[PDB]
Amino acid sequence: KVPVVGIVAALLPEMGIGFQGNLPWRLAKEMKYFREVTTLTNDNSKQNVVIMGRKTWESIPQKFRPLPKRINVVVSRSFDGELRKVEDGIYHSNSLRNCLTALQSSLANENKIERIYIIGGGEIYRQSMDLADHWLITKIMPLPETTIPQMDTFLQKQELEQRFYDNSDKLVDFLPSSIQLEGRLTSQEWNGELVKGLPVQEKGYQFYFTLYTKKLEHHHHHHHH
Ligand SMILES: NC(=O)C1=CN([C@@H]2O[C@H](COP(=O)(O)OP(=O)(O)OC[C@H]3O[C@@H](n4cnc5c(N)ncnc54)[C@H](OP(=O)(O)O)[C@@H]3O)[C@@H](O)[C@H]2O)C=CC1
Numbered sequence: 001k002v003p004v005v006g007i008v009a010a011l012l013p014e015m016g017i018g019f020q021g022n023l024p025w026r027l028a029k030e031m032k033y034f035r036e037v038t039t040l041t042n043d044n045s046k047q048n049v050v051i052m053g054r055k056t057w058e059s060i061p062q063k064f065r066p067l068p069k070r071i072n073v074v075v076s077r078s079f080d081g082e083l084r085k086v087e088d089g090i091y092h093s094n095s096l097r098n099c100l101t102a103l104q105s106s107l108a109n110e111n112k113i114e115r116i117y118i119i120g121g122g123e124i125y126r127q128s129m130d131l132a133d134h135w136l137i138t139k140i141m142p143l144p145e146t147t148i149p150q151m152d153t154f155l156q157k158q159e160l161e162q163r164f165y166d167n168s169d170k171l172v173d174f175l176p177s178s179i180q181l182e183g184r185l186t187s188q189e190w191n192g193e194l195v196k197g198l199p200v201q202e203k204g205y206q207f208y209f210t211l212y213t214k215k216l217e218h219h220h221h222h223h224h225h
């Protein structure tokens with residue numbers, strides 16, 4: 001029953017996330033939000049998991065990986081098993097889906113995990129739409145005079161709004177209590193769409209911390225023996 005949460009920073013309106021193997025931007029305060037969210041837990045005896053594709057792993061400076069105080073899991077089609085420790089703080093997996101089922105096992109995890117964060121990869125995010133319970137999406141907008149950066153990787157916005165709804169009214173409650181943010185819940189229009197969340201401003205960008213939650217589901221079938 002461990003919540004699976006996608007976390008990503010995306011530039012509106014197309015929701016671009018990467019370019020040529022790196023981020024299209026460099027925002028310290030967005031990085032800090034990511035570090036604190038994925039690291040902090042409400043229960044001190046637990047840690048969070050961070051799962052990521054191989055290319056995303058290789059984009060992290062060798063000095064900052066693996067991400068400290070979080071269980072790191074790198075997935076690659078050419079890895080040996082569904083989940084194996086290869087280094088202190090580093091697990092390898094050849095399957096995102098199996099990797100998750102493995103993590104959920106309370107025998108294996110001893111209920112010592114609080115949340116599972118899918119920290120990205122365009123290819124990974126694309127496969128996480130049916131897997132994630134929530135999405136922590138930082139919606140980014142270039143200020144009036146800011147140049148829109150070039151991007152080559154994007155989040156599935158259609159799939160997102162098809163399965164999830166903007167639950168940003170519940171962002172603060174959803175985050176680990178230790179975290180404190182500067183802004184307050186704001187709701188504004190940008191390029192036609194409604195943008196709601198906790199507003200921040202750094203460099204030439206304005207961004208919003210938002211939360212997306214699974215849309216209510218009809219009861220069609222429940223398995224019986
Ligand atoms: N803005 C944001 O919040 C974030 C942005 N990014 C950006 O995304 C870009 C990287 O994304 P992308 O290029 O799509 O690469 P990914 O990070 O998504 O990794 C893709 C690789 O992951 C492995 N893989 C994919 N699916 C599976 C699976 N189902 N099971 C096991 N392994 C799998 C494969 O590795 P292999 O080839 O070894 O088999 C594949 O080549 C970068 O530009 C980065 O900056 C990344 C994270 C966050």
Ligand SMILES: COc1cc(C(C)(C)C#Cc2c(C)nc(N)nc2N)cc(OC)c1OC
Pocket residue numbers: 007008009023030031034035056059060061064118119120136137138
């Ligand atoms: C490119 O360097 C880094 C990339 C990343 C990745 C690419 C894994 C990321 C991310 C990410 C950010 C920055 N924001 C949000 N909202 N979600 C993310 N997955 C993490 C890092 O440590 C925090 C990095 O070093 C500081």
